[model samples]
Target chain A: MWAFPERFEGRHVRLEPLALAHLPAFLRHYDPEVYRFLSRAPVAPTEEALRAHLEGLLGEPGRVNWAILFGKEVAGRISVIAPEPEHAKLELGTMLFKPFWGSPANKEAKYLLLRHAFEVLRAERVQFKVDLRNERSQRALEALGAVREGVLRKNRRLPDGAFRDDVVYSVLKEEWPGVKARLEARLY
Target chain B: MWAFPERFEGRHVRLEPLALAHLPAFLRHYDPEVYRFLSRAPVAPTEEALRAHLEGLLGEPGRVNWAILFGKEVAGRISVIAPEPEHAKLELGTMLFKPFWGSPANKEAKYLLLRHAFEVLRAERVQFKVDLRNERSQRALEALGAVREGVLRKNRRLPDGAFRDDVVYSVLKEEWPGVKARLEARLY
Candidate 1:
């Protein structure tokens, strides 16, 4: 019930449907710190293992992933995870190379994804989950006008067997217009 | 990584792994009002349709369902939905016949499930979600000492094509002992 677009272009970044061809670019910017709060990562930080991991993600159901391009370089990746079209809701997730952290790459990528979710997909709710320890990510979502919903305790088990609490956030359909305006003002 | 129990027993209720054999008992007490807040129901309130719907539920991944029995009669149904063993968390969902309401049927069912989840399954969290409009269910969760987490807006669309917000609640592992004591006092 959900359609995956081939590409979304913005002034600061572009989103292209993720592909195996993008693996080299991802490897080029590879850093273990980027996956600090993520659920999945290569067991051994090797190109072959990472490629296998990304390949496994490519076939995951109910998900649409994209590679973020800043000019000619791949800055990172983003995805609409576990979308429920019948419910008119979805979640947004992104990971950026450290070099692209302070730049407009991640913000513009989120802008493109959120705009498409609310405007094109007719979504009534777009939500996010951040690790409780990740204050930077929490602040970023707050800056985008997303409401802090609540914390889910012990929601995930990390690769190292540590439990992590996730802080939930959401931007409802009625609140999207203001959020879009704020993001646009900042980007421009 | 989660293991399903064959059955659970208590003074007011007994939970047996759901089977097609219980279909007749369900139909005997079947009242459309019982499904008022549920996501699924027979398009036409007929046995064949209901059977098909229940059949569909049987194979759902990550769910363990049970038919709630009081004496020899089936009084309701309950399930552990979306149990995440790696995360040590799960959700509880139940629906009961009107005749069974206000009795210990639902409460005891929850107590047994919660005890097994925390003690046997080693779960760190157990959660429930009720439609925002369903105050009775919300109050029931509150009475169980579950903390009201937050409201998730437009999280589900009903069979009538109406959107519904969900109110989430949870009991963390640290709070389980107190909850268990309170439940035992009330039940015994």
Candidate 2:
């Protein structure tokens, strides 16, 4: 198992594993819309409720979610789900507090991710699936030059009474060279 | 083993088992641009070259290419790939002359093949893959209600020095009910 802080320093973002110590900021930054498109789960109604929700996350199997921090404040969260150590494929999901939206923090977070997955983990492919209608999320993917595949219509039914149409996108390890260049260019 | 249809007829289409009889129209409807983002082998050039290619297809182990016809004129082509009865999956691909795009004839022709695959052949899932960049083809998959699953980024290289990202989509036996309804709704 990889440690969160292993990815923290020597990169643009520092990933500190979830600690009870970080619980306060996590609660402070909690925004309801942040979980709007997250897989159909119950939203926390109060501080106690949020903690209870995260308490369940603390023991989530086969996945690890890190509260992404920007200068000591919670900016978002990213998770690696049912990670395929051998094939290097994993179900990845991320959310950024609105403050960090349209910023380098997200790209840096993803860059660090691509680096770790390919450079350290030696994965063959890293893929991201997003709601087909989430044009904002898709624009970021398109900007990264991550190829857009078509929608998986009726992937799942959402809580708000709609079916999920997932837009599958990915970046191969071999394409990292060009992706890294483009990411760096955008940041500069 | 399945017998090549001497012909397939729908409301407005007559599907002809590809033969010398359909060669002239097939050549006329062939569109090189239809293959712009396919990860498959290189696209063929010229009617003579494409005809020679069809001869090679006849020798392929277990595949059927039907020239989709409208009023006895070749308007498009549809084919099955990698058929395995036990596996219960038969991937499909189709292409139409630019003029046939979005026509009712094209829709009925596809429905005919889908019905054959699910009703007669008893396929559990019929799959389709398109170039990730071919928005038009991808949109067609959407209209057909195929589930978009994953993106194989840099999944394949074209004859030119470029590569194609393939998007995989599927129509399952379970989803056939809704898709059938939606297609019928198009009529009335």
Candidate 3:
């Protein structure tokens, strides 16, 4: 009802609405290492491309997204796409600022998104898919209590011209109550 | 042919005859925690049920199993089933003991089996399906350089009353040579 807040407290960090003012400072959060397995680059190769990247994500409906933050520090971004009728599942994905590499911030962002989707929106399920080759993300999900769903092999073409596998994981509506508590507890 | 040695270290772990002798050690390796997400539990609750599990694979058409050995320890069972239409592609799946986790021995076992299938047996394709929750197996396949082709959601149910998704990863006769070498490099 109310305009989406400029930022929502993620499980561990604050998720902020992307604004042009944030871009210059936001460039620091983009890291080659962290984005390795991501199918697309949230921040593009050049400053111009970065502007385009933000506009593209902000424009898509099923692909609505936000920048994650912790005070002045940029934590990462957690994006929740609108649900599709045939699939009937809303997807949640995160792009972490490398500094939060193993921190509680990443997990919290996911916790926040899953909560908004299932508890408030009354969605049946929320799905997240990571690249199977990404050791980093798999470890993060283990900490988040999300169940490993399955893999979609050759699921899509990475921007770099390589075939990428989508490692599927999800939190069901019924399972959210407990999963959310486990997540919220981590914030303290 | 004489029963293949219990552990054929060709390129991956391979079992010989998958005999009843493997039960005691395997039962110990059958971990309830890890089996929580797996579609098939080689060592499930109750001895009678466990024994039936082994026999189910051992009894299938052209069923030939070998107890996978790792450094002289029985790690798990390697089996081949559903090969009746030899000309048509046959299905290949394996269950490994938890202790052998992260060891590339499964790749070696697969290489041996796949090589035998494509070269010795003249098959066109050797396919593997991972239980949607079996993230370990899926990664291992990717590490083995297997091309993941697709996923079947809510594919079936496990004996434990959980819905399971199946992810298909495979290697074709045309891609076998390069895949075999990559797999071997990983095992070593």
Candidate 4:
């Protein structure tokens, strides 16, 4: 079966199980720029809308959500989406507020999640799908030593009713050692 | 909502909704070679095992299963698996018995399904994932003008406890015209 840690600690970042209390911080750091490249956007900036969205993500089965914490403050949200234990694989999804854009929180959060997927859950594969237009995110993944699988055309419809293509990437079980070394070298 | 035809008719092959009655023919044409490169294999050759398998497939939500019929004989089984109406995408999966391997049944069945996905369901993308070791299937997909996405490493564990990699391919809605022409030229 799929398993995930209750908390993951890094040098400068920590991943805590997402809770309703974190919603206030999410609202505090909410920025429209962060949602520009994502498939879904908040219906409104109201707490009620964001609360509904968070609840939807939390209620989704086969998914584990976490709040990325830098010190005591919430930086953003990250998730182990669509964990298919039968296939021994999963997808990593994250959204960092604009303030945390260039911080090490995103990278460290991913590092924590990837390590758990490979070493703890024994996942054979972990994948990330980024919007093709999001070159920054794409480059970030490339920097992390993830292999680009290929582009999935029109995989999702954005909130604006525009089609979005996703560039898929993955780090296989055997490739984890190399990736882990690279991430640790940079993070440490 | 997602919709599929009760039946799809091609020049030489037909697709009928899979039923329990088709199980007997499946048992009749069962061959070990057909399942060699697939992620799944029959638990046993007995009716009970096949029945259970068929029921599982039939009961799976977001999947539509069909029996590939070549002039009233069951050639094999095909399915529009994991139809994501929300994402406007789906996956095509098939297994043809040994005797019907070289025939036009597989190609025509795919054509019918693709046309439905693009025209009827208005799917933005339709994908097929083949085992990396299945070179013939890969070539066939290329011949049909589908674009090779990339390999997904260790995506599944086979019945023998061996890991299997999948090579994904897709035909986008915008490119459907070209793919349709190519498939028609060969099939006709």
- Model no. 4, DockQ: 0.70
Interface RMSD value for candidate 3, one decimal? 8.5
Q: Which tens-of-lDDT digit does each residue in A28-79 have in candidate 2?
A: 7667676666554435556676666566666678677676777766677677
lDDT per residue, candidate 2, B79-156, as tens digits?
887676644667777777777887766677678778787777766767787888888988877877787776676555
**Residues B1-188 of candidate 4: C-alpha lDDT, one tens digit per residue:** 68898798988888988999888887888777777798667778898988887898888787888999988788887898778887889999988898888788998888898998898888998888999999988988988898998888787788878888888899999899998898788889
What lDDT score is found at residue A22 in candidate 3?
A: 65
Question: Could you tell me how far off, in angstroms, the CA of residue B71 lies in candidate 2 after the best superposition?
Answer: 34
Which candidate gets the maximum DockQ versus the true structure? 1
Candidate 2 Cα misplacement greater than 4 A, ranges? A1-7, A10-12, A40-42, A159-161, B1-151, B154-167, B172-188
Writing each residue's lDDT as its tens digit, candidate 1 over B1-188 gives 46877778788899988998888877777787777777666676678977887886787886778999987898888988887776889999988888888878888999998988888888898989888887889888877899987888778888788888888899999899999888888788
TM-score of chain B of 1: 0.94
Assess candidate 1 and give its TM-score to the true structure. 0.90
- At residue A125, candidate 4 shows an lDDT of 85
Among these predictions, the greatest lDDT belongs to 4
TM-score of chain A for the candidates in order shown: 0.95, 0.85, 0.87, 0.95
Docking band of candidate 1: medium
lDDT of 1 at A109: 83
Give every collision pair in model 4: none
lDDT of 2 at B146: 80
Which regions of candidate 3 fall more than 4 Å away from where they truly are?
Answer: A1-6, A10-12, A42-45, A85-88, B1-188
Give lDDT tens digits, candidate 1, residues A1-188.
88968798999889998898988876777787877787666666678977887887777888788999999988888998889988889999888888888778888888887888889998998989888988888989998899998887777777778887888899998998998998889999
lDDT of 3 at A57: 75
Determine which window of 10 residues in candidate 4 chain A has minimal summed lDDT. Answer: A33-42
